[PDB]
Amino acid sequence: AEPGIDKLFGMVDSKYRLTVVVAKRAQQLLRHGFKNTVLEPEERPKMQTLEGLFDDPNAVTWAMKELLTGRLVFGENLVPEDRLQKEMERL
């Protein structure tokens, strides 16, 4: 399955919120590239044949195992929306 799906159901009230947040996370991971990660130093996804899971074999698992750490914060209205919604799509 996926790492700690029960844990993932732990910190979110509704599973649909979980789906939204993880997929949106994958969306920035695509748009800025996988440089904007918060698990860089030691614990990265580890591919079998090589270290291919360093860059981008699957963004959804990247976002999920990003969420298991405490470095991800989500909310209904956490940031003034307009600034980052116009700065996200333009780079």
Partner: protein, 1096 residues
């Protein structure tokens, strides 16, 4: 290899010709062989003599007498071989000898007029219509005549119906209303029957003397004496009851149209309505119907007996004389001959109206052949009946059994006005008279269950859709060889024994004998028996009579097994089943698939394509072979020679194999070693595990031929030329296209390779191998405008058809099945080393999951497996009748002999009992299978008697704990059409009206996603998934283009706009006077469109 038969029953008669129904029907319909002078008139000659002799007494140029003399037809324009190579109809033109007479002088006789072309039936029983061949299935419906049915509401009374044919004809209904009313509605308006009774000239005194003497319900008609003294003015009043507005001075307008010929049925004398009449009521019905026109007055022989006997039934009781709607004695089968005759007479009546009009507008007289008869109406009627009718269906030439069963298949539905798909649950069930006439198992599962059926093997239609079952006459206690074919109504009067009753030869050996009094299983003494069943085979169909152990199988599983037997593809090296029933030779003989020696003689030459045989008369005859003939379903029909040069043959002896025959035996499938034990998971629920042994030697291998076609036609831009040249690029791949446009024969082809090079306006539109699979090109046919005898679709200059053959071998995707319905799919093909094997080195072929046996009820396959086990060592085949097979002691003794042979061969090599076998024996001893205290010799023998032998795993080497049943079973590979083929596509052609993706010939096309899948997808929280799968992936052209471009660019797909589905919806509401705009939170409109709604 010997064959041993088990059944102890003497078949007093053999199977009648399995396809005789269609052959006899059509040969009676077409009397071409007999001279036209012969008395035989029913069929097409009946239609001619009935309608065509138009007479005109006085209308303008009176004296018009167009009479019929003879008819003839003797030469098809082309042989049926070209008729299949070139898409013609295997037909013969019809000529009629007609002649014209006037009241004045003149006898203008035209001997030969071509009036339509009528198709001719082939030897087997099919018809070739346009290239392909079809079969016209027999139909079952109400037998014409007189029936009495209880009132749907009123329980005390009932109604009578006299039902002639055609539907555009009489339909008489008699009913009794207690106030003294005998109501009779003719077509749509009810009418007091007493007026019509007076019309026929019956007066009151003899009516009371001969009818009202016994019954007190005579007051139901004797009450109406006010208008029963009117001989002829009754005719005027009755015609006034009709409302045509015409003057009443038409004595024989509608009063006589129910006379001799026009309206009332011409049901065959004696039976078709008279047997339904004369035995049902009265004594005999002289003539064809009720009529009198020799004196202007009217006479009948029907209405008086009908009213008398109805009054007897409603008052007293002559008998339980209520006719069941589904009783088979009151149902009648229209064969292909009857359907063809009816369509022919419809077309002939159309021609009669046309010629009447032509005469009415005709001025002079010497115009008999041309200005009178035109072939267009009758030809069109015949062609439409043989092309687009419901009962003329594509022949299923998958194997001889399929074609034979299709030829002997009876349908309850048909043109539509008889019975249709929606609701038929009342009639789908079988009846007590189906015993020996209709197989209660042949019905196909699905919507058409019970409606479509097949008749019994011993069943025979006599002359009028009335199936007769054979029966042996029993006199006292001796069973006589005399055989009588009996009808249902005749059958319901005697006591019928059963074929399995013990017999002393010519004497019944039982005290209590089972019987059917009237469709009711009872027990009687031998002295009260009159008739005996000929054979159990008569109670089931041909396709059912092929199942060996039917007595130990379930009805549903028998149904599906018999259905899969029909769709078994023939194999390259097929072989007859180890356990057979005894009908395989009859099936291969009666279905014209093999070649037989018509007379005693010696073979002269045997080649791969023809056999020249010199008979004893000194005449040598050459038999060609359809070496590789594509079937309707795409299989292959081959005749393999079975004789050697200079070999003596006997009369009726085999010459060459059929498509699926070993040596005069129906062989569609293989005999394999099957072990019934659950393997790891690869036989989970119904799946099947097979060795590579069946693949290392080609053992389940078949030939499949696909027929591609392409047209070059004349367009407004210009003609399309099929040329070797390719316009733009392909020249390196053109090397395969050796000749002009067509690919060279014998060249292997892959999907996506050019096959026919056709050029348009220069634009390349070339037929290519479809994505998927391709084999070896074998044949190419080109038909151009230079027509020798061929025709083309208008505007098409030429056509080419290409046949590609490929050798399908058994693989994972395929499915297999036995004769007992145990469907399966090959789930894994194991190597030979890791399959279970006997103590001897021989490994088993196929592994079957036991759990499928108790869930269903098919113990027949277990007995078959035991008998196949015995046969594998004894090296012999067995024949067992379905309900007179081998008892358990017999197969036990055979297994004992087989074990004797097997273990004696084991000991001859100098070996005892393996240690693995010793511990397995001890384990089985703890399980109670084998009696304790015995040596491994007799313990293992007793284990063999159970049909179980020790097996070794082959992967571990350790024996399988507990014994396993193993044996030889007959398994056939089922017809494998596009059903498995991967309709898997990504991007292909899209539809034109809407942008839904749909392919077909070019690409497979998408998958149904319907509404139930929408509901299931949206039961989950799936939101964007449904949005993409309904708009991005299905409808939005720019959305799917952008998605494709983005995924090529490796980016997330863009969001859809307010989707073009809803923008189309808004613009469609905009098209009418409507007003649709999307609103924000407050009452201020939000423009869906960017700036496109604003003008300028």
């Amino acid at each position: 290899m010997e064959i041993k038969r088990f059944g102890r029953i003497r078949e007093v008669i053999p199977l009648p010709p399995l396809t005789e129904i269609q052959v006899e029907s059509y040969r009676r319909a077409l009397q071409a062989d007999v001279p036209p002078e012969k008395r035989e008139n029913v069929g097409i000659q009946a239609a001619f003599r009935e309608t065509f002799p138009i007479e005109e007494e006085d209308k303008g140029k009176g004296g018009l007498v167009l009479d019929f003399l003879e008819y003839r037809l003797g030469e098809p324009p082309f042989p049926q071989d070209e008729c299949r190579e070139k898409d013609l109809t295997y037909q013969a033109p019809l000529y009629a000898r007609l002649q014209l007479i006037h009241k004045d002088t003149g006898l203008i006789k035209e001997d030969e007029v071509f009036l339509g072309h009528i198709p001719l039936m082939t030897e087997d029983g099919s018809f070739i219509i346009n290239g392909a061949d079809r079969v016209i299935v027999s139909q079952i419906h109400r037998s014409p005549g007189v029936y009495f049915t209880p009132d749907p509401a009123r329980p005390g009374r009932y109604i009578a119906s006299i039902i002639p044919l055609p539907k555009r004809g009489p339909w008489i209904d008699l009913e009794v209303e207690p106030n003294g009313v005998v109501s009779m509605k003719v077509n749509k308006r009810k009418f007091p029957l007493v007026l019509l009774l007076r019309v026929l000239g019956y007066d009151q005194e003899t009516l009371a003397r001969e009818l009202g003497a016994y019954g007190e319900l005579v007051q139901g008609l004797m009450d109406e004496s006010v208008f029963a003294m009117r001989p002829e003015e009754a005719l005027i009043r009755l015609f006034t009851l009709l409302r045509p507005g015409d003057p009443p001075k038409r004595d024989k307008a509608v009063a006589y149209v129910y006379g001799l010929i026009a309206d009332p049925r011409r049901y065959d004398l004696g039976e078709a309505g008279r047997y339904k009449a004369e035995e049902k009521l009265g004594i005999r019905l002289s003539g064809r119907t009720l009529a009198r026109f020799e004196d202007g007055e009217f006479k009948d022989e029907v209405f008086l007996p009908t009213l008398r006997y109805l009054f007897a039934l409603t008052a007293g009781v002559p008998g339980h004389e209520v006719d069941d709607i589904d009783h088979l004695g009151n149902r009648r089968i229209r064969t292909v001959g009857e359907l063809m005759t009816d369509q022919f007479r419809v077309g002939l009546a159309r021609l009669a109206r046309g010629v009447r009009e032509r005469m009415l507008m005709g001025s002079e007289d010497s115009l008999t052949p041309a200005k009178l008869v035109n072939s267009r109406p009758l030809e069109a009627a015949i062609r439409e009946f043989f092309s687009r009718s419901q009962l003329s269906q594509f022949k299923d030439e998958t194997n001889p059994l399929s074609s034979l069963r299709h030829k002997r298949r009876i349908s309850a539905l048909g043109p539509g006005g008889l019975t249709r798909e929606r609701a038929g649950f009342d009639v789908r069930d079988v009846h007590r008279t189906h015993y020996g006439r209709i197989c209660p198992v042949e019905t196909p599962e699905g919507a058409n269950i019970g409606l479509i059926t097949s008749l019994a093997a011993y069943a025979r239609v006599d002359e009028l859709g009335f199936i007769r079952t054979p029966y042996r006459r029993v006199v006292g206690g001796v069973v006589t060889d005399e055989v009588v074919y009996m009808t249902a109504t005749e059958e319901d009067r005697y006591t019928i024994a059963q074929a399995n009753t013990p017999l002393e030869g010519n004497r019944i050996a039982a005290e209590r004998v089972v019987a059917r009094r009237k469709g009711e299983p009872v027990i009687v003494s031998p002295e009260e028996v009159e008739f005996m069943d000929v054979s159990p085979k008569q109670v089931f169909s041909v396709n059912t009579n092929l199942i060996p152990f039917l007595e130990h199988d379930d009805a549903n599983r028998a149904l599906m097994g018999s259905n899969m037997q029909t769709q078994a593809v023939p194999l390259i090296r097929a072989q007859a089943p180890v356990v057979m029933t005894g009908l395989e030779e009859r099936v291969v003989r009666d279905s014209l698939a093999a070649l037989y020696a018509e007379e005693d003689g010696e073979v002269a030459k045997v080649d791969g394509n023809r056999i020249v045989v010199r008979y004893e008369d000194g005449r040598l005859v050459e038999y060609p072979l359809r070496r590789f003939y594509r079937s309707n379903q795409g299989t292959a029909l081959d005749q393999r020679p079975r004789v050697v040069v200079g070999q003596r043959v006997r009369k009726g002896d085999l010459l060459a194999d059929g498509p699926a025959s070993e040596n005069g035996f129906l062989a569609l499938g293989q005999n394999v070693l099957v072990a019934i034990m659950p393997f790891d998971g690869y036989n989970f629920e119904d799946a099947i595990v097979i060795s590579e042994e069946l693949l290392k030697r080609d053992f389940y291998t078949s030939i499949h031929i696909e027929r591609y076609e392409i047209e070059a036609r004349d367009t407004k831009l210009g003609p399309e030329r099929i040329t070797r040249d390719i316009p733009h690029l392909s020249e390196a791949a053109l090397r395969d296209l050796d000749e002009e446009g067509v690919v060279r024969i014998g060249a292997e082809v892959k999907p996506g390779d050019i096959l026919v090079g056709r050029t348009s306006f220069v634009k390349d539109t070339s037929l290519r191998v479809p994505p998927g699979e391709g084999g070896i090109v074998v044949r190419t046919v080109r038909l151009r405008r230079g027509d020798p005898g061929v025709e083309l679709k208008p505007g098409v200059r030429e056509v080419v058809r290409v046949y590609v053959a490929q050798k399908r071998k058994l693989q994972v995707g395929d499915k297999l099945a036995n004769r007992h319905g145990n469907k399966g799919v090959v789930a894994k093909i194991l190597p030979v080393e890791d399959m279970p094997h006997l103590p001897d080195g021989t490994p088993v072929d196929v592994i079957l999951n036991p759990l499928g046996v108790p869930s269903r009820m098919n113990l027949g396959q277990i007995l078959e497996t035991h008998l196949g086990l015995a046969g594998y060592f004894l090296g012999q085949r067995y024949i067992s009748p379905i309900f007179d097979g081998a008892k358990e002691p017999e197969i036990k003794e055979l297994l004992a002999q087989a074990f004797e042979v097997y273990f004696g061969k084991r000991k001859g090599e100098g070996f005892g009992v393996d240690k693995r076998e010793v511990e397995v024996l001890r384990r089985a001893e703890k399980l109670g299978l084998v009696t304790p205290g015995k040596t491994p010799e007799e313990q293992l023998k007793e284990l063999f008697l159970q049909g179980k032998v020790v097996l070794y795993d082959g992967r571990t080497g350790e024996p399988i704990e507990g014994p396993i049943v193993v044996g030889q079973m007959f398994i056939m590979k089922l017809y494998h059409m596009v059903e498995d083929k991967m309709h898997a596509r990504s991007t292909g052609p899209y539809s034109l009206i809407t942008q839904q993706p749909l392919g077909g010939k070019a690409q497979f096309g998408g998958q149904r996603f319907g509404e139930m899948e929408v509901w299931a997808l949206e039961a989950y929280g799936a939101a964007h998934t449904l949005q993409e799968m309904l708009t991005l992936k299905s409808d939005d052209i720019e959305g799917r283009n952008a998605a494709y471009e983005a995924i090529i660019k490796g980016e997330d797909v863009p969001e859809p706009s307010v989707p073009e589905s809803f923008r189309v919806l808004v613009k469609e509401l905009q098209a009418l006077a409507l007003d649709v705009q999307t609103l924000d939170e407050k009452d201020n409109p939000v423009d869906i469109f960017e700036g496109l709604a604003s003008k300028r």
